[PDB]
Amino acid sequence: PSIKLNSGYDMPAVGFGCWKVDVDTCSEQIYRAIKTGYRLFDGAEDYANEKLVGAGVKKAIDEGIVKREDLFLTSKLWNNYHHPDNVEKALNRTLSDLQVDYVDLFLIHFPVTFKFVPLEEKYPPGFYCGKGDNFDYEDVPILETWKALEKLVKAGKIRSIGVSNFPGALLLDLLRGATIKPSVLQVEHHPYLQQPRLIEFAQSRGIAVTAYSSFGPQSFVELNQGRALNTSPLFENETIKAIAAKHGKSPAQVLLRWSSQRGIAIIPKSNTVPRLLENKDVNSFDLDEQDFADIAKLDINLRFNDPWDWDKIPIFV
Ligand SMILES: NC(=O)c1ccc[n+]([C@@H]2O[C@H](COP(=O)([O-])OP(=O)(O)OC[C@H]3O[C@@H](n4cnc5c(N)ncnc54)[C@H](OP(=O)(O)O)[C@@H]3O)[C@@H](O)[C@H]2O)c1
């Protein structure tokens, strides 16, 4: 099952999330997921594993299990790299780590502009902005970054371009300046942060929405985030359990189906082989209108991935 992007390419509707994949088994896991049937891999410069991902894919291509053209590789431009002189440096490093000639989707990871740090100096940079333990920022409007991305599509290094973690007003302004329109909007999306109007906006413009953190706080419990600890797991939620029992499906299948059935692409992080199988078809069943209505009541605007936490960066205020 596939989503036709406005660029003309098809994006697999269910993918494999590469954030915080155990580093010692990362290449094996990618290979294994490809062999299990996953065709989209959601990666990023910031996840620090693009070499590992690229070896997984190398192996599966060499052993004949898949062709390059059957895979959909996503990556994301990190925040130090928005200046138009530096966009291509970061993309070239992603292409070399992945060992490919083009990437299928290249996203602006965040509408946040860290001071550039040369790649030989520190890669990937994280929060380092070339000034000690201090944040430092540069004045590069989004549209400058976007125009640099558009040249990289024209040069055949990227097929489709998009954005991650953009609010509505910012996306709307980007649409006014874009020649190639954004193909994808990738945002945090689970029942505790539903943002229904944002999704409605993006879909009405023909922009495919990718949900991340479909399991909500669970991904952030790994990092000991205070907010995530302190949140009741979605898996134990009384409504999610009623709905699971009603359809004979697991909580996790209900949480993923809630998005996939609304045409929203999913990219769950799938650590074990049964999870790999379970997460790859939740499209075995339909939620009904009463189900959506009961899940809609869980929305509390609880956001786990917020740059306000990093440095009071006002992306979501
Ligand atoms: N800013 C961005 O654009 C951004 C930010 C975050 C994520 N992402 C992307 O979206 C992807 C997915 O989001 P995520 O990594 O936050 O986590 P997620 O997919 O919400 O949650 C992953 C966690 O759920 C548990 N899990 C997975 N499948 C399960 C199942 N079938 N049953 C029960 N538990 C299950 C695992 O927890 P345990 O192993 O702890 O049991 C795993 O750590 C990322 O990997 C990344 O590619 C993008």
Residue numbers in the entry: 2 to 318
The authors write:
In the oxidoreductase pathway, two enzymes, xylose reductase (XR) and xylitol dehydrogenase (XDH), are used to convert D-xylose to D-xylulose using xylitol as an intermediate, and XR/XDH enzymes derived from Scherrsomyces stipitis (SsXR, SsXDH, respectively) have been introduced into S. cerevisiae and Y. lipolytica for D-xylose intake. Aldo-keto reductases (AKRs), which include D-xylose reductase, are found in almost all organisms, and has broad substrate specificity for sugars, lipid aldehydes, ketosteroids, ketoprostaglandins, and chemical carcinogens as substrates. The overall structure of SsXR is similar to that of the AKR superfamily enzymes. The monomeric structure of SsXR consists of a core domain and two auxiliary regions (ARs), AR-I and AR-II.
To elucidate the cofactor binding mode of SsXR, we determined the crystal structure of SsXR in complex with NADPH at 2.0 Å resolution. The NADPH cofactor bound at the back of the TIM barrel motif. The residues Phe216, Gln219, Glu223, Phe236, Ala253, Lys270, Asn272, Arg276, Glu279, and Asn280 contribute to formation of the nucleotide binding pocket. The adenine ring is stabilized by Glu279 and Asn280 and the 2′-phosphate group of NADPH is stabilized by Gln219, Asn272, and Arg276 through hydrogen bonds. The Glu223 and Lys270 residues form hydrogen bonds with the ribose moiety. Two serine residues, Ser214 and Ser220, are involved in stabilizing pyrophosphate moiety and the nicotinamide ring of NADPH is stabilized by the residues Asp43, Tyr48, His110, Ser165, Asn166, Gln187, and Tyr213 through hydrogen bond networks. Interestingly, when we superimposed the SsXR structure in the apo-form with that in complex with NADPH, we observed a large structural difference near the NADPH binding site between these two structures. In the NADPH-bound form, the α9 helix and α9-α10 connecting loop (Gly217-Ser232) were in the closed conformation without crystal contact, and the Gln219 and Glu223 residues form hydrogen bonds with the phosphate atom of the phosphoribose moiety. Based on these observations, we propose that SsXR undergoes an open/closed conformational change upon binding of the NADPH cofactor. The crystals of SsXR in complex with NADPH belonged to the space group P42212, with unit cell parameters a = b = 97.654 Å, c = 160.12 Å, α = β = γ = 90°.
